[PDB]
Structure formats: C-alpha cells, structure tokens
Ligand binder design. Structure first.
Ligand SMILES: O=C(O)Cc1cc2ccccc2s1
Length: 167
C-alpha cells in the first residue's frame, strides 16, 4: 500500500490520473518524481520548468553543478538527483524530442530507466511540447515499465482521450 489517490488502473503496474505533477509531488512527496529532462538539464519549460519553478530554482542549481562535472546526458538516458521539496529523489529522464529531430525509437530506452525504481510519479515522456504522439508514449510505457508507475497527465482533454483509446 502507498499514498497515491484517485488513479485509474491501466495494467498490473501502470496507473493514471488527470493531475498537475507539481501539485501531485507536493501532496504525495513520493520517493521518486520523474522529470521530462533534456540532455543539458536546462529546465526551461514543461514538466522540467514547472518542477524547477516549484523548487525555487534549486533543481537548476543542482543540475548545472551535475552537468559541469559529468557532461550532458544521452537521449534515452537519465540521472538521479535530489527531489528537493517535491520528492526524495528526482529521476531526470531524456525522452526524444521530435520537435528537435530526435529518433522516436529512443522512447523505449528512456522508459527502461524507470525499471531501476520500485515506485515512480511520472509524466508522459516525449508527449506535450516533446512532439511525440501521447497515445504512443502511453503504449511504450505500459509495454516497457515493469515497476509501479503513477502517470500524472496535466491536460484534461488529453487524459480523457488516453483513457478512452487505451487497449
Ligand atoms: O501531461 C500532459 O498533459 C502531457 C505532457 C507531457 C509533457 C512532457 C514534457 C513537457 C510537457 C509535457 S505536457
């Protein structure tokens, strides 16, 4: 038993809710919140900006130190950093950005990072401003992640569409 509330069950291990991931993280304070990162950990917009804004920019300060030491992530890759005021840990995962020309085939590699954590609060990787088809991203999630994933879909209309179209 855990602390997540009002999620629809999609599969044995995947749950979904129409929720702001920031508000969800503040309420639940999960062990792991997933950030929809880029390889530079430049948290300008979307989930990264909203999460970063909610940390008062501490996520970006930590991230710049991480990049200065380690260099950029790989598309499909991840790193674990602090969750600050939102979670124990933040798993920064780089899904391919279709709007930057990145290969959508790397989405499965991105979701494999979630398997290193027993429970995660996560967004829909490569969807929204990443340019991928969110229906596809949910299918790859369900077909790749074996650990317990709580998907927070921000967009109301998109949440309804994902549930109604889910096989
Ligand atoms: O939750 C949503 O509505 C769908 C989105 C996924 C995502 C990923 C990165 C950046 C923004 C967004 S919006």
């Amino acid at each position: 038993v855990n602390s997540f509330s009002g999620y629809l069950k999609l599969t044995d291990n995947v749950y979904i809710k129409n929720a702001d991931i920031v508000e969800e993280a503040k309420k639940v304070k999960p062990t792991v919140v997933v950030n929809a990162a880029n390889v530079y950990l430049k948290h300008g917009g979307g989930v990264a900006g909203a999460l970063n804004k909610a940390t008062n920019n501490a996520m970006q300060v930590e991230s710049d130190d991480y990049i200065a030491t380690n260099g950029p992530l790989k598309v499909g890759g991840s790193c674990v950093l602090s969750g600050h005021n939102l979670a124990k840990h933040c798993l920064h995962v780089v899904g391919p950005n279709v709007n930057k020309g990145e290969d959508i085939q790397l989405l499965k590699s991105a979701y494999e990072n979630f398997n290193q954590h027993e429970v995660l609060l996560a967004p829909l990787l490569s969807a929204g401003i990443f340019g991928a088809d969110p229906i596809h991203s949910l299918r790859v999630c369900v077909d790749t992640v074996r650990t317990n994933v709580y998907l927070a879909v921000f967009d109301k209309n998109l949440y309804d569409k994902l549930v109604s179209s889910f096989l």
